[PDB]
Curated annotation (Swiss-Prot), chain A:
InterPro entries: FUR (IPR002481), Fur_C (IPR043135), WH-like_DNA-bd_sf (IPR036388), WH_DNA-bd_sf (IPR036390). Binds 1 Mn(2+) or Fe(2+) ion per subunit. It comes from Bacillus subtilis (strain 168). SUPFAM superfamilies: Winged helix' DNA-binding domain. Possibly oxidized on a cysteine residue; the Cys-SOH formed in response to oxidative signaling may rapidly react with a Cys-SH to form a disulfide bond, leading to the loss of metal ion and inactivation of repressor function. Oxidized PerR can be further reduced by thiol reductants and repressor activity restored. This is Peroxide operon regulator. One of its GO terms (cellular component) is protein-DNA complex. Homodimer. Keywords: Cytoplasm, Disulfide bond, DNA-binding, Manganese, Metal-binding, Oxidation, Repressor, Transcription, Transcription regulation, Zinc. Hydrogen and organic peroxide sensor. Represses the expression of a regulon of peroxide-inducible genes such as katA, ahpC, ahpF, the heme biosynthesis operon (hemAXCDBL), fur, perR, zosA and mrgA. GO terms for molecular function: DNA-binding transcription activator activity; DNA-binding transcription factor activity; DNA-binding transcription repressor activity; transcription cis-regulatory region binding; zinc ion binding. It comes from the Bacteria. Its cofactor is Mn(2+); Fe(2+); Zn(2+).
Length: 136, 137
């Protein structure tokens, strides 16, 4: 399980798992959205009455640092979060902004090709597909 | 041809070409960098003593709107600009931010595949490749 593994990964970097830090994870696993802190907040305010939104935004910043989630920094504005379940391409709606998952290998090529044509130690690549829902 | 065609396209949407508006283009064609307003500014302050940075930032915003240049919005603070041609790929330096340009036909595949697996009216795609120089340079 993705819970099981992730929970051990926290232990590994030190991070102790309080009941709320757990609740945030279980949510990130189950919710096949790409939620923002506030969606996590209002979903979990439960239940966790004394937890602030910044605190969500902090736990997430912990999880990010220990490679248990990616921060979709784009853009503006508020930030979205995936879960490094891996991996993974993003198709976004130009209108509502929803984020269907989808996979496509491969893929390299560049890495490999550009590495050739530019003389660059290629770290990784980012690929986004844009369109519309579903309408929306 | 580069200039010739572009100059005609301004004429097309109406936009009149003053000496400075011209100087900006010739620069954008010649400089196979992906300059920012300020690189264009300090390069052309010349020569064009009375033209402000915002003015550059405006003519470029004109050129953008009439599809003669793309604005590399990413990111944070300053914006980069690339004189549109065809059609087109970017590999970025994680250290100094240099932008080479490569080409990988193609393409698509998805676009097409995703369109199938998600039920989307796929407009376009964006692809960057990240690495390091060259060391840098
Ligand atoms: Mn995703
Ligand atoms: Mn380019
Ligand atoms: Zn939509
Ligand atoms: Zn570099």
């Amino acid at each position: 399980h993705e819970l099981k593994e992730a929970l051990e990964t926290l232990k590994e970097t030190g991070v102790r798992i309080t009941p709320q830090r757990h609740a945030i994870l279980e949510y990130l696993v189950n919710s096949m959205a790409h939620p923002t802190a506030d969606d996590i907040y209002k979903a979990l305010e439960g239940k966790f009455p004394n937890m602030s939104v910044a605190t969500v935004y902090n736990n997430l910043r912990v999880f990010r640092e220990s490679g248990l989630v990616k921060e979709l920094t784009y853009g503006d504005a508020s930030s979205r979060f995936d879960f490094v379940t891996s991996d993974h391409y993003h198709a976004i709606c130009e209108n509502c902004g929803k984020i269907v998952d989808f996979h496509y290998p491969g893929l390299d090529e560049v890495e490999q090709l550009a590495a050739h044509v530019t003389g660059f130690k290629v770290s990784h690549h980012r690929l986004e597909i844009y369109g519309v829902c579903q309408e929306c």
